[PDB]
Amino acid sequence: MDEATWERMWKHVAKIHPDGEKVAQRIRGATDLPKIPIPSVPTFQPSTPVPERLEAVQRYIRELQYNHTGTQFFEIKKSRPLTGLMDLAKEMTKEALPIKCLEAVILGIYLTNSMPTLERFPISFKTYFSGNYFRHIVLGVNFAGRYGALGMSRREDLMYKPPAFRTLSELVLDFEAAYGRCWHVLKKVKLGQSVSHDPHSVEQIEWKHSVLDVERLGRDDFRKELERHARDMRL
């Protein structure tokens, strides 16, 4: 980044951390900082089953680490065509900096475009806790009829799910259960359509093909809606 952005990040750190300034003092200009190895982009043999590929993609995403600095290094315009977002995913791979939830979805798509038998689609959650609303997003995946997820989260059970769930409902309620364990109520689930595997595609991601109000719907109406959406992803 430039110098303005760079000095923005450190002044923003100066505010939010208790001893904001001494932290910059110790780190900026430091000669003995830990060299961080640049993560290797995962490449797959054709004999490797797709589930093992997904574990390798998720390991790479984790390897970048969650972005706690309070300054996001890769702006994501959700309306950009896919070929624009894939250029940006390529640059995350080359810059190799920490990331958050939205950036991991773009990375997950970039790294799974080589798997045409794997369906990818965004799943975003709106949860409530202690007077505040919270938004999170992962990349839903379907392989051989079973559902899973790639993502980046601050909690271990709000990102990676191996593709073992037999229906989309089970995948989403697993996420709801995980939210409930940390006292978040699931308010709304937004599911997008399958993302094209063409990294040069001029099409947008359809982030909001289905919006489900989990309380105004009710349990059984929530599940039938997720199954119609799964069916609609088999075009």
């Binding site: 750190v13 951390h17 780190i27 680490q65 810059e95 900096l97 920490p98």
Partner: peptide, 29 residues
């Protein structure tokens, strides 16, 4: 050329500090 090695050495320096900062911010929870 010599202009381009200065931009690779500036990005490597920033990355190191970004990850040192990320470590400090991660251990503030």
């Amino acid at each position: 050329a010599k202009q381009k090695s200065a931009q690779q050495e500036l990005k490597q320096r920033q990355r190191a500090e970004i990850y040192a900062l990320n470590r400090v911010m991660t251990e503030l929870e």
